[PDB]
Amino acid sequence: EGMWLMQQLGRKYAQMKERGLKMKEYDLYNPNGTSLKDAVVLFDGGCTGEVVSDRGLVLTNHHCGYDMIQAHSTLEHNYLENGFWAMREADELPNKDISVVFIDKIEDVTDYVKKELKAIKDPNSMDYLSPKYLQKLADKKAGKNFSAKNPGLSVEIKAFYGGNLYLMFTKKTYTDVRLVGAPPSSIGKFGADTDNWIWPRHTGDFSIFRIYADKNGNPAPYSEDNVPLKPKRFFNISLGGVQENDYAMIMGFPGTTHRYFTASEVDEWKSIDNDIRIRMRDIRQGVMLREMLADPQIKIMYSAKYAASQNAYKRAIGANWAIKTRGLRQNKQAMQDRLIAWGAKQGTPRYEEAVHEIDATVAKRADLRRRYWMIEEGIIRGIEFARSPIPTEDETKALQASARKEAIDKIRTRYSKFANKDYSAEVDKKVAVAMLTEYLKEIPYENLPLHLRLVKDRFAGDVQAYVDDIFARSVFGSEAQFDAFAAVPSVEKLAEDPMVLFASSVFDEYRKLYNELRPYDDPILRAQRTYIAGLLEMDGDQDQFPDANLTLRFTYGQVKGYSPRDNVYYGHQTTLDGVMEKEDPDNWEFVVDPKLKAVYERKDFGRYADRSGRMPVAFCATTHTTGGNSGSPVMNANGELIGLNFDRNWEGVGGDIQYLADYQRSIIVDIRYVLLVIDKVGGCQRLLDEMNIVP
Amino acid sequence: DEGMWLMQQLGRKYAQMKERGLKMKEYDLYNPNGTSLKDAVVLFDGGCTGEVVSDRGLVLTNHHCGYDMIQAHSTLEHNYLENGFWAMREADELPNKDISVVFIDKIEDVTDYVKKELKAIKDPNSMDYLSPKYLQKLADKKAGKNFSAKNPGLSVEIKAFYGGNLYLMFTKKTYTDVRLVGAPPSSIGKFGADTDNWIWPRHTGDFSIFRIYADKNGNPAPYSEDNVPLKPKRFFNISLGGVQENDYAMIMGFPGTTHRYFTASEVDEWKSIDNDIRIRMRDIRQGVMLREMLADPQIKIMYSAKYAASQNAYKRAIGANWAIKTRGLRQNKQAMQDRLIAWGAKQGTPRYEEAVHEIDATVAKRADLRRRYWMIEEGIIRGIEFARSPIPTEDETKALQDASARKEAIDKIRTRYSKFANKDYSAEVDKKVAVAMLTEYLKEIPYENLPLHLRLVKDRFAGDVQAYVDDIFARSVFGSEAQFDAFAAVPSVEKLAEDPMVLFASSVFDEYRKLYNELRPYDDPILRAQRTYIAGLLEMDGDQDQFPDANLTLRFTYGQVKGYSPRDNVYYGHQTTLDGVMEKEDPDNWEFVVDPKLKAVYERKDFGRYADRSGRMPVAFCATTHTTGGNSGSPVMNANGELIGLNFDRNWEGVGGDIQYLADYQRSIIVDIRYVLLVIDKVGGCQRLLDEMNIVP
């Protein structure tokens, strides 16, 4: 059910032992010694990874290492397409701007932070949540020259439970992390967008890296003299596999949850955030799909844009399904009513006052938040010409020194980036006509961005004519129109340009709405500190975890499928047979790698197949995970690596607000499938040899 | 494999059925010389199955079987199709025009009689052995002179089985006064609508209720106000015990057609010609149609039924091709024919191998013609609406070329134009569909094989299909209402003889008929060789584990209540519940709206004695019985012969079951009788129907 702090392992240990955990408490997490926690890393600031060899080999997802694989890919050596397999350590590819963070130490500094906070003077100060203020406290506690006296180490204090608990983390960061291996994208991203958030899943979502360090294992930036890190702890790989009901646990860095939302915040999330994103993206995607299906060149240009829009669209659909069917609003209402009743009995009215402040703040910001989401989904991300060039103050104070050419070259560069090889003005006009029609129906005249008032005042309500006029008269409407402007440029032409006025007006309104809404966050945050303090005083910090905040957490559960709907059951494990069932040679997402197809046909599964002779691919578990847990190690009851978390099903996206025992599942790539791909597809035997594989 | 057994085969299957769970005595299910459960089964309205469930002639069948009768009695004031219908007294039950129920009174093996009559052969290649006219002459001879007049309501019919190796004579008792008694709203009767067609899990309460009326002595009589409900020989008892996983289940009904004795070359032809062409052409047609329906709400209204009708056989062809590709259908037919050829070589009889060779050679010879026939039928005859535009008849052309009969010819042509260009016809949508369909057709069919008018695409329009189609509508008398009216004011034969749409329609129909005429002779050598092929299979492995192809005659099938795994890590159980109906509810989607009375019954858990042991309300179940089209409305029986459900569909994964039964995928989709009784009781409030039924605890 939760994403527990490492400090909470002691309190949870007996429940974990009753669920199947076999390893000793301090072998998993030891606050003053080496433990399994020391083999977990925050991979590239947003993913999880794990050390799997005494030579610093690291496993993470394919979608986590995607940028590094793509940056090393060329037409001659397309690693993104065919995979990459370094046959020697010297062949492993260095990566610019990469990092791996180890959580060396974790310490509770709540009393220290609360004592420092007592010197505030302003009772409504937000320093208790300020990264700048908390970093000043972290530096004071660790010492002035801490990073100089302890090379590779840094300190950081984070707030938890809305500012009721503070932890200081001592982090060891390595920046020389080299690409070692990756399967082809046909394995690493098999389902591609069709199978995103989907269980059953047949994706071998993994990639392999290696941490490099100086001669003493200390962090060092990229250098040809760097040597593989000999870590103090690494995961043993299990080949025993998984069975239904087996204990499974994960360690990783979940990003964000909203477990302490009020019922009014659940209503706001559904009726504003989700409904607007769903409505606007459905319109945008609908026009885009029509144009992509009618022109093969439009499909090539808009495929990535369509896919990027669909990602949070599907998340919003899954979240709204949970709000509608799993009683999320009702459960938050019952939670706050229980605290209010308990507060009335104890004679402390501040908990009811805190819930009231949140409700009043949510109700007060409703129209502004609706206007913000409408402009953001409808125009800022919905219409491409909203991000068309806007002349700067320096560029206008150049067109009217001979830096007129410099001002024109800078504007030309931004025009070329806007109207790039993937931009279609005809597709954009069609999308804008549909998006603006919906926007103008939802936003009244007095709340419109100034330029949009011209739809009613100048074009008699004709959205098509307003959009046609923007492109017909704008210097950014076509290449020939920009070149005519660049030959005879004047600031009068730019100041009255219809596209410049549209872009400026919609961005002005977007910023103004952001500025008016920003002050509403603080009273909610301050009231949440009181609300969560009451919940912890009432029911204790035993069965209620702190919201995820990109810090190291553990979660446990079982390998278990679920019933998505009446008479339908999805089991706990998928097989290579399921990959072959989905193969479509003419559908780019479902092409199957010929080497993988041959391994399946010959049943060349070696020691990786299950007891039945079937080759496992992925499994699902009742662990509680979210974004940030991609690449997390999945452990056995013995702490051995059995898989890597890579996704969660759409039915469980509502799990960020309320964990859903009967629907929410972590989607995990089976470690047996990872080794089958390294061995039979990559032929990289040296990686298998350096891992400690247990029978 | 698991089949559609003749009633005659019950004796030799009885021990296997008993070992699979059957508890009733053999002659209580089927007795060739006395009353049995077979006497409670009817062929409903010539294409469905039904069953008698009371001593007063109450009949249950599917909602989609009784659909036309419910629709014919529906008005704006009393919309029975939308809200359901529940007659609260026998006098309130609605009579139906053109309805019938057929009882199979007697079934007799007349193989020796037919084979003796056939020996009076004038031509050894005669097809009289399969001729309904010839077989009816033999049936009348055996029954006697004026059988229908001497025994009113009774009629006789002989049918061929096993490719002409077995003949059965059926004595049928037909009743034509069958009145509508009850029907659930379409929200229950067709809950899944087109989305859930051929789909398991299924949550559709597909049932309707009728009553057989007869004269004072229970004899058939056309509709009369003096008619009285029929007191039948036998009726089904209703079981309330329900079903569990692995329970024995059996069905009796009228499966229409199967192709269990196809050669491997006929399976290849079915896949590579029939199915691939239908799939390709319908995907193009549906694609253009969907794009126009999504862009214009009025086009969606006009083309929704046409789109749905095209999708029905398209989905069936997809499901059939999935079985051919994944379930080794071609390989299993090949093994079957190779086993017969090996056995024939040991028996010293080469005629079985010669018969398979004749089928293979005939299939290979007709390949190009059959490809051309399917290409024109799917691509143009069905694919393009203006292919069925008016063509002036020989008498209409002769009338237009010195009498007042010219105005009659114009009125007849106008009537056909008004039917073609009706309220649902869009010339713009049709032109777009035709451009895409003709582009594919012209790519597949060479110039020398094209219908004459289509040669103009290359010869006159420089390969521009769009211009050719535009010219058809711009210059045709049937291109618009204003163009037809201009023709009707000044009509001439010369205008019609050179009309581009008339020439297109005539040319494509000429080619379609010519191809049909050239292909028709190839059917006979296959049929004659199939008689020899199936005789060999029967002689080799016996009439014990291989059933005759379905031919709209009474058959029984047995199996178990069992779900299946459609794909890796996915399992569909054996039973759906009312909770599944509520999960699918969408108030703004016509297909998935839920009746408020049903939703209230679910919320209050007012399930009475109809709920299962866990308090859940069952809706439908699936079984490993072998069914096909014609089995809609079939009674589903318990091990005791009690009614547990009505068959109403089969899953798409099992459509290949017409060629080879698929044990791990094919399932009959059945409405649970507990759900039927729940709807009659809590939704219709028709207690009198429950009271006349014999319900067993």
Ligand SMILES: Oc1ccccc1CN1CCOCC1
């Ligand atoms: O299989 C994939 C899945 C997701 C992303 C990319 C691929 C690779 N495809 C690239 C071009 O199309 C054929 C292979």
Ligand SMILES: Oc1ccccc1CN1CCOCC1
């Ligand atoms: O100003 C608001 C904005 C969003 C929500 C609620 C209000 C308060 N009221 C003002 C008067 O009109 C009725 C709503």
Ligand SMILES: Oc1ccccc1CN1CCOCC1
């Ligand atoms: O529920 C049905 C299922 C299939 C067909 C027809 C209906 C009835 N609907 C008609 C219009 O939409 C609301 C009811």
Ligand SMILES: [Cl-]
């Ligand atoms: Cl380390």
Ligand SMILES: [Cl-]
């Ligand atoms: Cl012979």
Ligand SMILES: [Cl-]
């Ligand atoms: Cl099968």
